[PDB]
Short mmCIF file of C-alpha atoms and ligand atoms in Angstrom, two decimals:
data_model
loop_
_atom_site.label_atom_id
_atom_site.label_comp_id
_atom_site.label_asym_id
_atom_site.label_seq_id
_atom_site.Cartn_x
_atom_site.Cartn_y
_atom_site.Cartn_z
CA UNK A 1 -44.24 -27.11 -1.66
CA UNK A 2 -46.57 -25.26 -4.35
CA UNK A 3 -47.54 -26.19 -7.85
CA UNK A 4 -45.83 -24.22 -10.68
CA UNK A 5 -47.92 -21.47 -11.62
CA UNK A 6 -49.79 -20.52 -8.69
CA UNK A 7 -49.00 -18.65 -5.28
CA UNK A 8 -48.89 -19.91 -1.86
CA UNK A 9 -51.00 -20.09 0.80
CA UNK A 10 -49.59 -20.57 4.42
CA UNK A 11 -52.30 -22.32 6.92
CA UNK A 12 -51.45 -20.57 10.33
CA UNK A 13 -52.65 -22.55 13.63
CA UNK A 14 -52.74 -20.85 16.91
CA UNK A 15 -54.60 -22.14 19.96
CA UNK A 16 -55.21 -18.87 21.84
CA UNK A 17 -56.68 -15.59 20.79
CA UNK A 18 -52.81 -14.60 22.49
CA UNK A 19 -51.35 -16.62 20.26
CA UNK A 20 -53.03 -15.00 17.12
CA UNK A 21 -53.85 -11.52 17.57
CA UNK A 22 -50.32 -10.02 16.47
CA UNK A 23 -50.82 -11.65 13.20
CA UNK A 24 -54.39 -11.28 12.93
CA UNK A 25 -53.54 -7.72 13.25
CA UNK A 26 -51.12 -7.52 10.81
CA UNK A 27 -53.45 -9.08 7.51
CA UNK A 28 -54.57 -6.74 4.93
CA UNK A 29 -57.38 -7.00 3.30
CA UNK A 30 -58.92 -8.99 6.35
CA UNK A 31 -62.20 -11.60 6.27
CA UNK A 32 -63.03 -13.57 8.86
CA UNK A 33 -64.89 -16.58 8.92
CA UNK A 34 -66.43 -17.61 12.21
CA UNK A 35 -67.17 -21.98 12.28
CA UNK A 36 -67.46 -24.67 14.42
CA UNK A 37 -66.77 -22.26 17.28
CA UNK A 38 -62.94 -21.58 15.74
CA UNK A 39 -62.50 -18.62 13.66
CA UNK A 40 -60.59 -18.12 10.63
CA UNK A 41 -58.76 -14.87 9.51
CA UNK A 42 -57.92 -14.69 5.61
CA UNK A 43 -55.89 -11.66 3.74
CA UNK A 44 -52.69 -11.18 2.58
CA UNK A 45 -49.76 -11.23 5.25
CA UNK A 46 -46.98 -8.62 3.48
CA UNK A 47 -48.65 -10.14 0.26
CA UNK A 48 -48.65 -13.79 0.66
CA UNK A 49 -51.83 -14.84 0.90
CA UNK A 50 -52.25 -16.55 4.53
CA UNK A 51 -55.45 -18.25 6.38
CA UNK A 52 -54.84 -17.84 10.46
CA UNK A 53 -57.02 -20.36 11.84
CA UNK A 54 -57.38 -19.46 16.50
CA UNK A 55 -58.81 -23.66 17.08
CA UNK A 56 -58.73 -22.93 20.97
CA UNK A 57 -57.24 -25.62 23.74
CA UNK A 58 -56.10 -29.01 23.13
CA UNK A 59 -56.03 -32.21 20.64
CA UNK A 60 -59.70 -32.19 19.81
CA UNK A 61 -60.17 -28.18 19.50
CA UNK A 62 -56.95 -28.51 16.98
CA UNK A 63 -57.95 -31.50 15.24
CA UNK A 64 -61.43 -29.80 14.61
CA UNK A 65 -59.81 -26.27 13.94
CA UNK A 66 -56.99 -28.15 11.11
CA UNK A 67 -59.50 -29.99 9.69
CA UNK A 68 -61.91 -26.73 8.81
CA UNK A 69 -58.90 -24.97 7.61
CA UNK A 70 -58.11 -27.50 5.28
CA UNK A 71 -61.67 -28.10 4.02
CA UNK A 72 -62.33 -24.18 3.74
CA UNK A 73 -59.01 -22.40 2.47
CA UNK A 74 -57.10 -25.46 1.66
CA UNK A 75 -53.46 -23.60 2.34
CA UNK A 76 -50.50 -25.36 0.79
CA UNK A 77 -49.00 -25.75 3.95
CA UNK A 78 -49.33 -25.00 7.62
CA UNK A 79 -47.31 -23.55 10.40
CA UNK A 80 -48.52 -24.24 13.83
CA UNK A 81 -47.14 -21.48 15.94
CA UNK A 82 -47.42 -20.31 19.63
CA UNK A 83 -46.16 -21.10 23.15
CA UNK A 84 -44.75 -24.02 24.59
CA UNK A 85 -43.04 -25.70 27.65
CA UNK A 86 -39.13 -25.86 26.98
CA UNK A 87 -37.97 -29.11 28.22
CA UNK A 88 -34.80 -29.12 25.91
CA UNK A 89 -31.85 -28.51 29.01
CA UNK A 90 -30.76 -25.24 27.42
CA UNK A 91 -34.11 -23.54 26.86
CA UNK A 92 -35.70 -20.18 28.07
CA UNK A 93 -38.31 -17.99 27.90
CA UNK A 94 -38.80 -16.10 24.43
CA UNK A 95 -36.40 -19.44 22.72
CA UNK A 96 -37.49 -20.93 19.56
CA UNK A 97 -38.87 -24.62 19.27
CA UNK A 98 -38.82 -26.22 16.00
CA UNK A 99 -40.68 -29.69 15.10
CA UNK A 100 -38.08 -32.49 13.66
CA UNK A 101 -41.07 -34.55 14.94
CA UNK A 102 -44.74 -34.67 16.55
CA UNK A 103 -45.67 -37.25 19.15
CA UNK A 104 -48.27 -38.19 21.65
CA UNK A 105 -47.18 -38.13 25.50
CA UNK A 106 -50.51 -39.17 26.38
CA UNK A 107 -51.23 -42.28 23.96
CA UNK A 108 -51.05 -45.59 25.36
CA UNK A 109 -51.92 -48.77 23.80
CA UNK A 110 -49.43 -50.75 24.81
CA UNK A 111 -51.72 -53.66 25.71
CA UNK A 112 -51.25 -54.20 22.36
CA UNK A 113 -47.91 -53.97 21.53
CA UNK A 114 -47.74 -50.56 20.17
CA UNK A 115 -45.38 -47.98 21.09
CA UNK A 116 -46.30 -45.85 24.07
CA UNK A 117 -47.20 -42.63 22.18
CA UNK A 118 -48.50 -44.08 18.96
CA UNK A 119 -52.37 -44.71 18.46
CA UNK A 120 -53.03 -47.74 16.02
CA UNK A 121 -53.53 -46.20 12.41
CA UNK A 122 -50.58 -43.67 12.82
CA UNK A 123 -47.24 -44.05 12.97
CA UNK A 124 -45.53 -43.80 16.13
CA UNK A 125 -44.61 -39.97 15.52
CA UNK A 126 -44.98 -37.57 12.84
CA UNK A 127 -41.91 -36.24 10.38
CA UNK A 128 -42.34 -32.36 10.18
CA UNK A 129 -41.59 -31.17 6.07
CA UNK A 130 -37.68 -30.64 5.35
CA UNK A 131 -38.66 -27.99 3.06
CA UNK A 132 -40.26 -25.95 6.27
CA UNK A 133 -37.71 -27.01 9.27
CA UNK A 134 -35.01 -25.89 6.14
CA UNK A 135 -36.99 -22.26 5.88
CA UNK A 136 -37.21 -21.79 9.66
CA UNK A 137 -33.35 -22.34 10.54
CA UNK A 138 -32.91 -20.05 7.95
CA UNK A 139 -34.78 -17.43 9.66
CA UNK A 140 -33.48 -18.00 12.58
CA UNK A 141 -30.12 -17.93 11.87
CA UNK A 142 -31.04 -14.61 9.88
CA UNK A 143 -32.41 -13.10 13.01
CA UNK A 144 -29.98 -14.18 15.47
CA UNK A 145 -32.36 -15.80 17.72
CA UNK A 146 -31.90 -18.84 19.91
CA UNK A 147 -33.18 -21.78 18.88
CA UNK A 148 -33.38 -25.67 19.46
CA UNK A 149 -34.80 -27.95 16.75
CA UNK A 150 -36.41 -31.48 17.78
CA UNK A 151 -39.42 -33.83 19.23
CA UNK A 152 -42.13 -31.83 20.26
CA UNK A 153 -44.39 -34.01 22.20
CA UNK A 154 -48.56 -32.88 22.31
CA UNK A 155 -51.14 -34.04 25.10
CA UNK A 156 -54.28 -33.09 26.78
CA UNK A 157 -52.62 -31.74 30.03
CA UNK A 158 -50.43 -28.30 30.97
CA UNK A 159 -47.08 -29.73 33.00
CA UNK A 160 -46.29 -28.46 35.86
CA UNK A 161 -43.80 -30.65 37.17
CA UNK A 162 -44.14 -33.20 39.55
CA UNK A 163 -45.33 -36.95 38.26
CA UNK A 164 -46.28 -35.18 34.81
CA UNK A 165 -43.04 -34.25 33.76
CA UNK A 166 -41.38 -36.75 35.42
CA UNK A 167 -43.45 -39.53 33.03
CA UNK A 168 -42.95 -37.08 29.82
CA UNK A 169 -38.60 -37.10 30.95
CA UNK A 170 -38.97 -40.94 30.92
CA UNK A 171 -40.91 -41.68 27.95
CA UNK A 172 -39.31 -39.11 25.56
CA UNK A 173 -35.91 -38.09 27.16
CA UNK A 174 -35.31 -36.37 23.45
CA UNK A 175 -38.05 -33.80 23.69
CA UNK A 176 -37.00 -30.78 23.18
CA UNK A 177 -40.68 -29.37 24.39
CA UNK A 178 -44.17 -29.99 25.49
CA UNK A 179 -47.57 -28.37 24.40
CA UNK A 180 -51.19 -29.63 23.72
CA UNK A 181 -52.22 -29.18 19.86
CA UNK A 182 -49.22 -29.91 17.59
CA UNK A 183 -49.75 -33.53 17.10
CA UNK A 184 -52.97 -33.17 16.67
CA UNK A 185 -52.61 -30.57 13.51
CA UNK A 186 -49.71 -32.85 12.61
CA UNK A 187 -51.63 -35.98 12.31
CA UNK A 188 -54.89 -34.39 10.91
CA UNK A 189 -52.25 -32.87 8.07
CA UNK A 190 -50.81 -36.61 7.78
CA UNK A 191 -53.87 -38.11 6.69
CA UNK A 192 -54.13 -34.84 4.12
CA UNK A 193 -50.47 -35.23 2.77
CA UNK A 194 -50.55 -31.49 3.50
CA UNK A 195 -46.79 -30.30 4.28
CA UNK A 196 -46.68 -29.34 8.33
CA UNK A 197 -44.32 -27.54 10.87
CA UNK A 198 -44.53 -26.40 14.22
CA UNK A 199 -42.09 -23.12 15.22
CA UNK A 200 -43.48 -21.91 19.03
CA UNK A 201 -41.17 -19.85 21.30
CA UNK A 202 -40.88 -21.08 25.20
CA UNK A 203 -43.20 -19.75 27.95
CA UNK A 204 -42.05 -21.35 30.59
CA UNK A 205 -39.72 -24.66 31.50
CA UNK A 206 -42.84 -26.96 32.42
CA UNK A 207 -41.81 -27.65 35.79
CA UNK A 208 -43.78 -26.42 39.35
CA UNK A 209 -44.20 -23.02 38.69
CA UNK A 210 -44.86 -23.15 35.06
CA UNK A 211 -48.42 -21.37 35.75
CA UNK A 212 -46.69 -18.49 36.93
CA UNK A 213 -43.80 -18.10 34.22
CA UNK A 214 -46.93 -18.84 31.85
CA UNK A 215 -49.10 -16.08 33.41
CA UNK A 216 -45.65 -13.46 32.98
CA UNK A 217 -44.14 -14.68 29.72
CA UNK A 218 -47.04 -15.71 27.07
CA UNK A 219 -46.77 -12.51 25.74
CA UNK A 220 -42.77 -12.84 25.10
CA UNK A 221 -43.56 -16.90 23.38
CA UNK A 222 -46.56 -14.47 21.62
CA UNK A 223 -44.20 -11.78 20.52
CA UNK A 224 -40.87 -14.02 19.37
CA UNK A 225 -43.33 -16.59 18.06
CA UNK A 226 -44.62 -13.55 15.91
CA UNK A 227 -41.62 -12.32 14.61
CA UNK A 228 -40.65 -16.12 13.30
CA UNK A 229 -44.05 -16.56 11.35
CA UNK A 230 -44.26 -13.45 9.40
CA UNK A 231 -40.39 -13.46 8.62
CA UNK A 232 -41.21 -17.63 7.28
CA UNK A 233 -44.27 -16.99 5.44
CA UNK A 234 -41.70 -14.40 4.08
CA UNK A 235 -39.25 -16.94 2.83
CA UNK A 236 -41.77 -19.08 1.87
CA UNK A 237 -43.38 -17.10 -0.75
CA UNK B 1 -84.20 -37.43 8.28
CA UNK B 2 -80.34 -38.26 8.10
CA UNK B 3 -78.68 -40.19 10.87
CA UNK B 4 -75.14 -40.17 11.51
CA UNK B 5 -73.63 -43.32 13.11
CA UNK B 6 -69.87 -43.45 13.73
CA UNK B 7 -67.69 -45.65 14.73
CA UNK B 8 -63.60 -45.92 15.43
CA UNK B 9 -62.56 -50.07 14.03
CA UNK B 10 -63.92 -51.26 11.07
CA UNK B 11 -64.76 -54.38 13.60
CA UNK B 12 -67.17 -51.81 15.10
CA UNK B 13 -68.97 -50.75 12.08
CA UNK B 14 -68.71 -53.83 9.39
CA UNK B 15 -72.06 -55.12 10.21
CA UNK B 16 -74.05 -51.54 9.76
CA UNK B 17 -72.13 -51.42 6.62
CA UNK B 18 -73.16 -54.70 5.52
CA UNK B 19 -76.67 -53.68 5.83
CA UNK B 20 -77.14 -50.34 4.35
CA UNK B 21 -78.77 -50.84 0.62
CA UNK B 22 -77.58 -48.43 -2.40
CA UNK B 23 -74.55 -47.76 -0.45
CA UNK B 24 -72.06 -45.47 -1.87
CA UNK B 25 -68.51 -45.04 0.12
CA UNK B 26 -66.30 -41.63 0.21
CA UNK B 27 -62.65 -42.12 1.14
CA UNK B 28 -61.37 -38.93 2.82
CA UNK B 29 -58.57 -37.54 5.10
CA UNK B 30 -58.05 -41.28 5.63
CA UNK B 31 -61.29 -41.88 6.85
CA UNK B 32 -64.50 -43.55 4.93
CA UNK B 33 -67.84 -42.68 4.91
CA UNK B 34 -70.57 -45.51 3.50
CA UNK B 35 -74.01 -43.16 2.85
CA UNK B 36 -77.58 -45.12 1.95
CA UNK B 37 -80.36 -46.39 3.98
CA UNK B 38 -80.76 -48.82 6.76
CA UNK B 39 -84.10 -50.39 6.91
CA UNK B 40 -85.27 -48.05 4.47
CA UNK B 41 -84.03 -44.91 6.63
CA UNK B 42 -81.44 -42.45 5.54
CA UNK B 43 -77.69 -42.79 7.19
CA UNK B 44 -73.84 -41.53 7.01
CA UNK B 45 -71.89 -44.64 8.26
CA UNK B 46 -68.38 -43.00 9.34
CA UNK B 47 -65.23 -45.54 10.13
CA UNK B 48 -63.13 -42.75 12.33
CA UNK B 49 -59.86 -44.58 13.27
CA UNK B 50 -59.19 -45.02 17.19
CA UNK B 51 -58.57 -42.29 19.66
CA UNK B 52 -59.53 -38.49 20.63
CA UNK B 53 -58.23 -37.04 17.10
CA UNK B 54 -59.18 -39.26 14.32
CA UNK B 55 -62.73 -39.13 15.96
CA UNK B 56 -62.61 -35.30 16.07
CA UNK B 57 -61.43 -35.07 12.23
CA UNK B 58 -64.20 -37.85 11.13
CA UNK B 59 -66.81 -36.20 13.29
CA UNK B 60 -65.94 -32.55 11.41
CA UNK B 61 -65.69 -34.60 7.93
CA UNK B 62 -69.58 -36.37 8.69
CA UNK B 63 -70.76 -32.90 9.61
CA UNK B 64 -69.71 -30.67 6.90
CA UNK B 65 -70.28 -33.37 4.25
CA UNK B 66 -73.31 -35.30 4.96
CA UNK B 67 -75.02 -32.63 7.35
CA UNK B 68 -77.00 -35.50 9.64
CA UNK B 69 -79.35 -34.66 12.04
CA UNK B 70 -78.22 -36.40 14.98
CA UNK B 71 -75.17 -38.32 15.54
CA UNK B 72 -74.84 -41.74 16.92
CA UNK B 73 -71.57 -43.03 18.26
CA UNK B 74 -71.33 -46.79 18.78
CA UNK B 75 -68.82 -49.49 19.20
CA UNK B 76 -66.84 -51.50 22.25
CA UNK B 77 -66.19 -50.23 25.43
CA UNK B 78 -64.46 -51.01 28.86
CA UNK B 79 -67.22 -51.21 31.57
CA UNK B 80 -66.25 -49.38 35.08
CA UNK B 81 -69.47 -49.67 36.70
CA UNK B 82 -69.72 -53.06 38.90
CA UNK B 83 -72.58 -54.76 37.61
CA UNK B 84 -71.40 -55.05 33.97
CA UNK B 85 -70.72 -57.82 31.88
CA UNK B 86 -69.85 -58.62 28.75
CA UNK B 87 -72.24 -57.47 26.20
CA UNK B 88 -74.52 -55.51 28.31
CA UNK B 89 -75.48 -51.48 26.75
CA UNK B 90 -73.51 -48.13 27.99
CA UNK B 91 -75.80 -45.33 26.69
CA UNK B 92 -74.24 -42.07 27.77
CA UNK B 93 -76.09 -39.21 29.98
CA UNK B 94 -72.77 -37.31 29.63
CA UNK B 95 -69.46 -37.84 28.06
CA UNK B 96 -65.81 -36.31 29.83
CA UNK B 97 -61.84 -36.50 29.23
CA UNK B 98 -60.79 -38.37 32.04
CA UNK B 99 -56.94 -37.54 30.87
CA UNK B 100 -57.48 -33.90 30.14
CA UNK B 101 -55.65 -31.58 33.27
CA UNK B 102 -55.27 -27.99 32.66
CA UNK B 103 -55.89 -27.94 36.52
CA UNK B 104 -52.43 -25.45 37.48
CA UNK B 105 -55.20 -22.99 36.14
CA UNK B 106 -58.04 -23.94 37.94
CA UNK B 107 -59.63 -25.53 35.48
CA UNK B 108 -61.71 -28.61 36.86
CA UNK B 109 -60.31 -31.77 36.53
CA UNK B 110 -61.15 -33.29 32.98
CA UNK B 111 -61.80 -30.01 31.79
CA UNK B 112 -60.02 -27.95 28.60
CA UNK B 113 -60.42 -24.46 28.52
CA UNK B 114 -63.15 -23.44 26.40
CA UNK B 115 -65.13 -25.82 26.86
CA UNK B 116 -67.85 -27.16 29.75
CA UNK B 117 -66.55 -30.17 32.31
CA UNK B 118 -68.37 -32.51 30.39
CA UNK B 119 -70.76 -32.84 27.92
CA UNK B 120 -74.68 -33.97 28.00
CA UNK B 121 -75.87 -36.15 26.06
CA UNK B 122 -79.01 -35.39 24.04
CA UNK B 123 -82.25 -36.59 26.42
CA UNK B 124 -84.50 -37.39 23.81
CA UNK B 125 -82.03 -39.33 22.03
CA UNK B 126 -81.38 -40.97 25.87
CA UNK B 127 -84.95 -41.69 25.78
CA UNK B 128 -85.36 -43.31 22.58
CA UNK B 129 -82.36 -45.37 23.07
CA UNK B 130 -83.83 -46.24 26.79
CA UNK B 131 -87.00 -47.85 25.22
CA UNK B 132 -84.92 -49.46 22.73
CA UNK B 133 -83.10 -51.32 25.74
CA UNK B 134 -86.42 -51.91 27.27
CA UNK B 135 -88.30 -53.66 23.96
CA UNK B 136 -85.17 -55.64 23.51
CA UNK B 137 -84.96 -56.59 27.19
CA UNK B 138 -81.24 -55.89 27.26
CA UNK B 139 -79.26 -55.81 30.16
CA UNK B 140 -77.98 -51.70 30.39
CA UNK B 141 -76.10 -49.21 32.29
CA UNK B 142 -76.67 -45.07 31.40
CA UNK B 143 -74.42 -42.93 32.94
CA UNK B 144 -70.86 -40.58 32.26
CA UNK B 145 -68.75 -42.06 29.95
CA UNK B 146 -64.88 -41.09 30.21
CA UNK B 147 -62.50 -40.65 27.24
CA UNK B 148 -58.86 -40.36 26.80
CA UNK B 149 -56.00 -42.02 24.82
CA UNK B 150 -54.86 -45.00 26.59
CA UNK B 151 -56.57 -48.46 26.16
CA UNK B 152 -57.40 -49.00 29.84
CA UNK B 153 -55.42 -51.93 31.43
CA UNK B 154 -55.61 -51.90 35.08
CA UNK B 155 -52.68 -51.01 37.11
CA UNK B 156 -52.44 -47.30 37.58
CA UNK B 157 -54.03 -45.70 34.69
CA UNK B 158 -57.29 -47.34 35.83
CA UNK B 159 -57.08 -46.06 38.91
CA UNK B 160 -57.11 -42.94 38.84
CA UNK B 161 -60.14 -43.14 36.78
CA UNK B 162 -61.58 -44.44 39.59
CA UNK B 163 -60.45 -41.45 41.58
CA UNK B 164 -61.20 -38.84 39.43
CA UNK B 165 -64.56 -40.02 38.03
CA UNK B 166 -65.88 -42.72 40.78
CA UNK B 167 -69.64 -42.57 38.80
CA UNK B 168 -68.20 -43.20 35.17
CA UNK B 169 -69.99 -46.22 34.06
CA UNK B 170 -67.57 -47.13 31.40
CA UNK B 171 -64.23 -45.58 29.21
CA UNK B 172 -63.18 -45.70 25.85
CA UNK B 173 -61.31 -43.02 23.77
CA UNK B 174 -63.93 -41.70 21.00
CA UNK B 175 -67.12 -40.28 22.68
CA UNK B 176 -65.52 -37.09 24.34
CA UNK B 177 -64.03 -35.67 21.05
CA UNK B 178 -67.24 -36.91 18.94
CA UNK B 179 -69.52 -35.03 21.50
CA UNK B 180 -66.95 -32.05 21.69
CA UNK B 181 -67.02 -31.52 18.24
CA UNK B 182 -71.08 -31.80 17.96
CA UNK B 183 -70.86 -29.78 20.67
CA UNK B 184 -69.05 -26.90 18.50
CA UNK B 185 -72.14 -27.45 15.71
CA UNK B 186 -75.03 -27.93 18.10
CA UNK B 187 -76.02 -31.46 16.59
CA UNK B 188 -77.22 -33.94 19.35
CA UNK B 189 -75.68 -36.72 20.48
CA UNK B 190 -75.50 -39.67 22.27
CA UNK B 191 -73.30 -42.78 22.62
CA UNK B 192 -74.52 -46.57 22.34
CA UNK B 193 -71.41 -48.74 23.13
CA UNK B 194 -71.89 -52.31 24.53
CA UNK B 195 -69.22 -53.65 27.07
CA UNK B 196 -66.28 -55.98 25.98
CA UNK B 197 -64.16 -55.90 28.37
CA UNK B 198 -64.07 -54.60 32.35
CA UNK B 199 -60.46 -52.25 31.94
CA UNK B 200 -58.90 -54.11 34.16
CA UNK B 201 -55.26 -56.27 33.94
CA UNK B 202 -57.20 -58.49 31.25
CA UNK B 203 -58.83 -56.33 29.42
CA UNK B 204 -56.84 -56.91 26.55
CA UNK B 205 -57.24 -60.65 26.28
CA UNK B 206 -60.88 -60.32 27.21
CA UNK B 207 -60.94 -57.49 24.01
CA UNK B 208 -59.44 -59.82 21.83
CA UNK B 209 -62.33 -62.45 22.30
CA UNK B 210 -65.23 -59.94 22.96
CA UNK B 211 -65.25 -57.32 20.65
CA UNK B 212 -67.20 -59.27 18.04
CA UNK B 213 -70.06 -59.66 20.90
CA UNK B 214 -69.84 -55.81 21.89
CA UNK B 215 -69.51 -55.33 17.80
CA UNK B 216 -72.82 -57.38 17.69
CA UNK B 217 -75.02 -55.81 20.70
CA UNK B 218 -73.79 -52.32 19.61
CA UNK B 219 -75.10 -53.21 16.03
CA UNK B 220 -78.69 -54.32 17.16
CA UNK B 221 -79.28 -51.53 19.49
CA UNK B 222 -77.91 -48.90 16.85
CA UNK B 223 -80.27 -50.68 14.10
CA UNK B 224 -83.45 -50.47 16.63
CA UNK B 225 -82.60 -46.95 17.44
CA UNK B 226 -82.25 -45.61 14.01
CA UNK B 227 -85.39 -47.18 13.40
CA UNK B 228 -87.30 -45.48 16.24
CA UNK B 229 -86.01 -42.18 15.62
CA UNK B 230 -87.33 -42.36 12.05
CA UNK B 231 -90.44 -44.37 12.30
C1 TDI C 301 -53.90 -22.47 29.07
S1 TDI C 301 -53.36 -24.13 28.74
C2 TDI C 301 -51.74 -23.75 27.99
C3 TDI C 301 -51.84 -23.41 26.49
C4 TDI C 301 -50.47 -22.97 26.05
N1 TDI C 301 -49.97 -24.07 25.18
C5 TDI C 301 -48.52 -24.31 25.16
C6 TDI C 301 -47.81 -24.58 26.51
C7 TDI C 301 -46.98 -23.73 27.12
N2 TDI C 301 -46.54 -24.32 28.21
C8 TDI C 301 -47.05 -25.56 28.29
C9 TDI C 301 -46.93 -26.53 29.23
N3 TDI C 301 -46.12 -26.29 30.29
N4 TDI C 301 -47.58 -27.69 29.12
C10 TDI C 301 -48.39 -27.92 27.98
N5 TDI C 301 -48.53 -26.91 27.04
C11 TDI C 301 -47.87 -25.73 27.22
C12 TDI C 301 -50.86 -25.24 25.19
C13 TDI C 301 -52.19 -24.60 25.59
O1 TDI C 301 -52.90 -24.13 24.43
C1 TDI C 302 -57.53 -51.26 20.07
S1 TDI C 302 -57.74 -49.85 21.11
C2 TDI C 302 -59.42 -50.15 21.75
C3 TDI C 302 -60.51 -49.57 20.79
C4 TDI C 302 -61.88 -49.97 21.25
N1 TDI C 302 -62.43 -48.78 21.96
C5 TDI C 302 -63.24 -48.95 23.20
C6 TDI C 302 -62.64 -49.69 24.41
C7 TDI C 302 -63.01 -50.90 24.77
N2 TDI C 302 -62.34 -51.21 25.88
C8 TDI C 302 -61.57 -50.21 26.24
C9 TDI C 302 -60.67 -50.05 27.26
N3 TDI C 302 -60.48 -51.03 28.17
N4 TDI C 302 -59.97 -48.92 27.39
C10 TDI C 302 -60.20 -47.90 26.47
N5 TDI C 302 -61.11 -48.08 25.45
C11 TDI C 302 -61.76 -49.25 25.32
C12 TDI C 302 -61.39 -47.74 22.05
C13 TDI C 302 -60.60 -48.06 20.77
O1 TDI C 302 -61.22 -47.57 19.56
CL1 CL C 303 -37.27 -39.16 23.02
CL1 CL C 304 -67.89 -39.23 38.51
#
């Protein structure tokens, strides 16, 4: 994961100022680095040296957001970490998500014989490290948490039952959860060969009233989501 | 004076690149980048990849490496508004996700949060690429363009474009991201496409014999407008 005789440094990816500020808080020796209209915190996280990138909402904000992080602090890896809709059958709010994989709910170009979720150029999902998923069960197992490891499937929409999940149940019956950035990072770090992994905690179960368990419980996904990333970057280093 | 000029297939762009003398090429994050001049004007020819993402890590890539001044996005496109054929110019007036719903919030339809509903295109750049259609006599359509990540294909995905955006002139799935990210770096925009197919059932057989026309009408009205905006 890093060259002999150097140190590490851990690309962080959160969408929402939610999603960051616990960690943000948390770096010493703090810089930031406001671009494109994402901003970039840089320090030492219990001294590993770590580059929190908040890319706001969705595939494009992330894609933009990844790529300035990897142009401007080029980390050794990243961790995209946050909230997300469980869809795994034994999932609940505060619950770990790990990425096996990354894929596209929204893609669709089968007129041409591709996959439904794969764009032409990529493949049809995206392998998350070993190395990383490896590190993360560790720390979960180390802090007793509950936790389901899988396909973590990205789009441009926040499910809310209905037709939306319904499609998602059908196309991916395997996926374990749902969000609306970690493809994007993924396949922005696949074209880098930059090692990637996503570890989120669940906000709600995607289903009708997935606005309200959002509105109540982003600050549990925030909290557990926390709590996985510094004890990682921890292990990592 | 640097223009930008991007484009998703190498179909789309292999005739710009042709045509741009001294012309060095940068391979990065799997993307390439030919930099020279066309007809003697200065240019950053960017081959993106298809869809919403490898168009938003090109666009950041053109930006922070070849700093242009304005940003032309070109290629195909599906046509939505009736009286398009084949061939005929889509210059955008504004550019919108027509798969984007973050709407259990409130949000409007299309919309991600952070950003506006849709984006405007540049109106000097609108205007310059309006008398380039006019000197050319070409046949032309300028309205909303819609982006997402399906290739549109009748049936029910084209549908509800027609519900949710019943004046979007034509789809494809580049613009949206391209102008989102300029959008992030203030650097204008617009988008020149010409039609190749109408998104319907077909689509994809008319694509497969068409996109060398749309390649080739894209390619003169990009060359024209380069050369207006310079000269
Ligand atoms: C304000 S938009 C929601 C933000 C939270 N993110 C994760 C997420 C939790 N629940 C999700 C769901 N039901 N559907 C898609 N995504 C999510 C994605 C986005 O940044
Ligand atoms: C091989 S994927 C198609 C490539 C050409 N681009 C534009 C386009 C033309 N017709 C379209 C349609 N019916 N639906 C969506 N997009 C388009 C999008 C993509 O780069
Ligand atoms: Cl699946
Ligand atoms: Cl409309």
């Amino acid at each position: 994961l890093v060259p002999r005789g150097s140190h590490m440094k851990i690309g962080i990816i959160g969408a929402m100022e939610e999603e960051v500020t616990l960690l943000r808080d948390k770096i010493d020796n703090r810089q930031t680095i406001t671009l494109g209209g994402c901003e970039i915190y840089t320090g030492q996280l219990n001294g590993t040296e770590v580059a929190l990138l908040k890319s706001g909402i969705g595939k494009v904000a992330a894609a933009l957001g990844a790529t300035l992080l990897l142009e401007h602090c080029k980390p050794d890896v990243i961790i995209n970490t946050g909230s997300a809709g469980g869809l795994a059958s034994t999932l609940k709010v505060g619950d770990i998500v790990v990425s096996d994989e990354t894929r596209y709910h929204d893609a669709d170009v089968t007129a041409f014989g591709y996959e439904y979720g794969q764009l032409p150029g990529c493949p049809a999902g995206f392998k998350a490290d070993d190395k990383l998923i490896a590190a993360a069960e560790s720390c979960i197992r180390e802090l007793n948490l509950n936790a389901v490891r899988g396909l973590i499937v990205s789009g441009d929409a926040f499910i809310n039952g209905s037709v939306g999940l319904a499609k998602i149940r059908h196309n991916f019956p395997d996926a374990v959860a749902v969000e609306m950035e970690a493809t994007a990072i993924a396949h922005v770090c696949h074209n880098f060969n930059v090692p990637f992994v996503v570890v989120r905690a669940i906000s709600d179960v995607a289903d009708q009233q997935s606005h309200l368990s959002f509105d109540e419980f982003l600050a549990v996904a925030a909290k557990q989501s926390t709590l996985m990333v510094e004890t990682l970057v921890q292990k990592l280093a």
